[PDB]
Short mmCIF file of all heavy atoms in Angstrom, two decimals:
data_model
loop_
_atom_site.label_atom_id
_atom_site.label_comp_id
_atom_site.label_asym_id
_atom_site.label_seq_id
_atom_site.Cartn_x
_atom_site.Cartn_y
_atom_site.Cartn_z
N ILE B 210 -1.61 -5.99 -14.01
CA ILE B 210 -1.34 -6.15 -15.40
C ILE B 210 -2.23 -5.03 -16.16
O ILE B 210 -1.61 -4.30 -17.03
CB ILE B 210 -1.67 -7.51 -15.85
CG1 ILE B 210 -0.71 -8.47 -15.27
CG2 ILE B 210 -1.59 -7.56 -17.36
CD1 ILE B 210 -0.99 -9.89 -15.57
N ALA B 211 -3.46 -4.85 -15.82
CA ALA B 211 -4.28 -3.86 -16.45
C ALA B 211 -3.79 -2.48 -16.30
O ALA B 211 -3.81 -1.68 -17.27
CB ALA B 211 -5.75 -4.04 -15.97
N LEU B 212 -3.29 -2.16 -15.06
CA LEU B 212 -2.74 -0.81 -14.88
C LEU B 212 -1.47 -0.59 -15.67
O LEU B 212 -1.35 0.41 -16.25
CB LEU B 212 -2.39 -0.71 -13.40
CG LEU B 212 -1.79 0.66 -12.96
CD1 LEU B 212 -2.64 1.89 -13.30
CD2 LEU B 212 -1.53 0.67 -11.45
N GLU B 213 -0.53 -1.65 -15.69
CA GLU B 213 0.66 -1.44 -16.37
C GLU B 213 0.44 -1.46 -17.94
O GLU B 213 1.15 -0.74 -18.70
CB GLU B 213 1.68 -2.52 -15.97
CG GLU B 213 2.09 -2.42 -14.56
CD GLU B 213 3.20 -3.60 -14.14
OE1 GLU B 213 3.83 -3.98 -15.10
OE2 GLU B 213 3.32 -3.81 -13.01
N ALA B 214 -0.38 -2.30 -18.42
CA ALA B 214 -0.65 -2.41 -19.86
C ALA B 214 -1.19 -1.07 -20.38
O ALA B 214 -0.78 -0.68 -21.45
CB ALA B 214 -1.67 -3.55 -20.19
N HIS B 215 -2.10 -0.51 -19.70
CA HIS B 215 -2.61 0.86 -20.17
C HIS B 215 -1.52 1.85 -20.28
O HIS B 215 -1.50 2.67 -21.16
CB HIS B 215 -3.69 1.36 -19.17
CG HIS B 215 -4.07 2.82 -19.37
ND1 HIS B 215 -4.91 3.23 -20.47
CD2 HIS B 215 -3.87 3.87 -18.60
CE1 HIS B 215 -5.09 4.41 -20.41
NE2 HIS B 215 -4.47 4.94 -19.26
N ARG B 216 -0.55 1.92 -19.31
CA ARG B 216 0.56 2.86 -19.29
C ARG B 216 1.60 2.51 -20.36
O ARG B 216 2.44 3.36 -20.68
CB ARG B 216 1.23 3.00 -17.86
CG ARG B 216 0.30 3.42 -16.80
CD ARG B 216 0.97 3.26 -15.44
NE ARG B 216 0.41 4.11 -14.40
CZ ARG B 216 0.92 4.06 -13.17
NH1 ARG B 216 1.79 3.28 -12.86
NH2 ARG B 216 0.26 4.94 -12.33
N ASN B 217 1.54 1.30 -20.89
CA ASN B 217 2.54 0.91 -21.92
C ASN B 217 2.07 0.63 -23.23
O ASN B 217 2.48 -0.29 -23.95
CB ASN B 217 3.28 -0.37 -21.30
CG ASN B 217 4.08 -0.11 -20.03
OD1 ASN B 217 4.50 1.01 -19.80
ND2 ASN B 217 4.31 -1.11 -19.30
N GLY B 218 0.97 1.43 -23.59
CA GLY B 218 0.50 1.26 -24.96
C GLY B 218 -0.02 -0.09 -25.38
O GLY B 218 0.13 -0.50 -26.52
N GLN B 219 -0.66 -0.80 -24.43
CA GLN B 219 -1.19 -2.12 -24.55
C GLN B 219 -2.61 -2.24 -24.11
O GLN B 219 -3.09 -3.01 -23.33
CB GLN B 219 -0.34 -3.15 -23.84
CG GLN B 219 1.06 -3.39 -24.36
CD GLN B 219 1.64 -4.67 -23.82
OE1 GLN B 219 2.29 -4.69 -22.69
NE2 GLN B 219 1.61 -5.77 -24.46
N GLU B 220 -3.47 -1.29 -24.73
CA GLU B 220 -4.85 -1.09 -24.29
C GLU B 220 -5.67 -2.40 -24.52
O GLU B 220 -6.48 -2.70 -23.72
CB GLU B 220 -5.47 0.03 -25.02
CG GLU B 220 -4.85 1.42 -24.76
CD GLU B 220 -4.88 1.72 -23.22
OE1 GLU B 220 -5.85 1.30 -22.61
OE2 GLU B 220 -3.95 2.38 -22.79
N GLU B 221 -5.33 -3.09 -25.63
CA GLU B 221 -6.07 -4.38 -25.86
C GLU B 221 -5.76 -5.28 -24.72
O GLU B 221 -6.69 -6.05 -24.28
CB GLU B 221 -5.73 -4.86 -27.23
CG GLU B 221 -6.44 -6.20 -27.59
CD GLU B 221 -6.10 -6.80 -28.90
OE1 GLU B 221 -5.41 -6.02 -29.71
OE2 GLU B 221 -6.57 -7.90 -29.32
N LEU B 222 -4.53 -5.45 -24.38
CA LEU B 222 -4.13 -6.36 -23.24
C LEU B 222 -4.85 -5.82 -21.92
O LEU B 222 -5.24 -6.66 -21.15
CB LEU B 222 -2.66 -6.27 -23.04
CG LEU B 222 -2.12 -7.04 -21.90
CD1 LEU B 222 -2.41 -8.49 -21.85
CD2 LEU B 222 -0.52 -6.83 -21.80
N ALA B 223 -4.85 -4.55 -21.67
CA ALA B 223 -5.53 -3.96 -20.52
C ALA B 223 -7.04 -4.35 -20.51
O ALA B 223 -7.52 -4.76 -19.40
CB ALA B 223 -5.24 -2.50 -20.35
#
Side-chain angles (χ1 to χ4, degrees):
Chain B
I210 295 175
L212 178 60
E213 296 186 16
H215 168 74
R216 297 171 161 178
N217 293 339
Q219 291 196 275
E220 296 304 325
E221 184 177 352
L222 172 61

